[model samples]
Target: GRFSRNLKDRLESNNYEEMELPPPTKGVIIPVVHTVESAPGEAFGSLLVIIPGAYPELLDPNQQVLSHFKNDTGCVWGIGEDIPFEGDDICYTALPLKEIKKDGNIVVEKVFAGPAMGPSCQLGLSLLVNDIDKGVPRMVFTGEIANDEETIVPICGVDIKAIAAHEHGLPLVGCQPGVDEVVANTSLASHLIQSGALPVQKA
Candidate 1:
């Protein structure tokens, strides 16, 4: 029984094993967008509905939310924490957008792989739907990892779930908000799209 003298134990998978990967560098995150001529009368119910936060389950790598996006695959490393919330300085991890294949209710028409917000203890994994049933298409956010330097190298190298809550940006010492409050406060991008703010008026 001989381990690779080069040392492979510390190597992080970062889900790159799941799909054809690139330089591990942040690729161009394209904003997925779906639009409709909502005259109030013809507005299909497909408004931007932000599902808010689901508080990633730190899923066992096999849970298959992506499902490897979490620790669901029995995990490669020690397995750790969720992304930090309720903080300013935060780290992030991102996977490719194309690998996603859920029923796009939000009709993800515009989005990109980039930084995102979530429990800093986790691997800043974001979701994109914005797709629709009747409307033209939804302007999906493709989502960003926000933390450009991070790569799952695990967010990158470290199992995001492995980062303890106390150490992450959003410390556990703060006033903890119940899951309901988290949901009430943080609206998923999907919910915000047709309902969030206003029409995109060119920044």
Candidate 2:
């Protein structure tokens, strides 16, 4: 904080010119805070689920499929790279990043979202938001193996995800190696970050 103050003081001392603020253009920013009341199912169903690295392929209504984001940069699609039926139904609760940090002095945390059959999730720039409404700079890759480098293949589909995380100063990122692996990782990271399960950071 003091560094910011020093920079401001230096600018003032140098008589730096300040540019006039420009008027809003293109689109307008909308306020998100609301006070409307409703039923549980109706009031709390859909939300801003952030998929950072890339998007996923919904093979079925209950199935979420992901492959490594390696084919292209502008691509957001996920095609099964290996044999199909790699993932299975598994309910994952929110894993706190602080506890993960406590377990190990690591910057990246891997939360396996499936069985031991599939690959690890993606890694990259991320601002994790926790239920406590705190933002942290971190990354997460969901699947089975987050530690095994043999299974934790990297993906390049997270250019934008990386940009966003870098914008917020994320130290590192993670993802599996498949068509939608990075996409799924990005989405999960976004969900956790936007949901306040992790915090944002800079360095």
Candidate 3:
């Protein structure tokens, strides 16, 4: 699928150069909070997890973790991984970052599952933020959902401003409502990064 022309136009308008950010200087800490919610009769459900990588000393903080849950639909359930089936619900809470550090470790305390989404659900890293006020989020670090793998893929480098817009229910500069196609195209961009297609960019 082709990317949305509108998104491309916006990207060009801003003179925004596409570049990958430096990788984690420290290990990324993901805390499995719990399964947050589920949609009735929907094959896919939402799970909220606390990503502890965004600490004060760390890079972009305030980034929310988004994940998908599924059952018997694709790769997720096919492996016999313990995830809730259709019609299940789940919930989770964000731990206070301060408390987490005080304990010197990240902890995902609870797990909930049922006819609704359950806690054992796997969560993925969705948004990346730089400073909390600029750039685009939801860039989909991973490609589109395929073979039913239920994992969150990092979409793009952190853009603080873009995420702020999303949190505030405002529109972003280069993001459109149905730009999944465009986001998917980024998978090629990601692959190029992996293949060292642009060494200078990696630097």
What is the C-alpha local distance difference test score of each model? Answer: 0.23, 0.25, 0.25
**lDDT by residue (tens digit), candidate 1, 92-190:** 222223322233322111121112222322212232211121221122222223444222121211111112221221211111231111111113332
* Whole-structure CA lDDT of model 3: 0.25
Residue 136 in candidate 2, Cα distance off native in Å: 8.0
Window of ten residues with lowest summed lDDT in model 1: 40-49
Error of 2 at 70 (Å): 23
RMSD of 1: 19.6
Q: Each candidate: how many clashes?
A: 75, 38, 25
Off by over 4 Å in 2: 1-90, 93-137, 140-150, 174-203
lDDT of 2 by residue, 1-203 (tens): 01133332332243222222121111000000011233111110000112223313211211233332223222111222322222212111111121223332322222222211223222220121111122232333333223331233453323333332333333233444332224333345555545433544655
Q: Of the pair 1 and 2, which is ahead by lDDT?
A: 2
What tens-digit string does per-residue lDDT give for candidate 3 at 32-112?
111223322212111222232322222122222322334432222111223333312222222222112222342222212
| Prediction 2 global C-alpha lDDT | 0.25
How much is the lDDT of residue 6 in candidate 2?
33
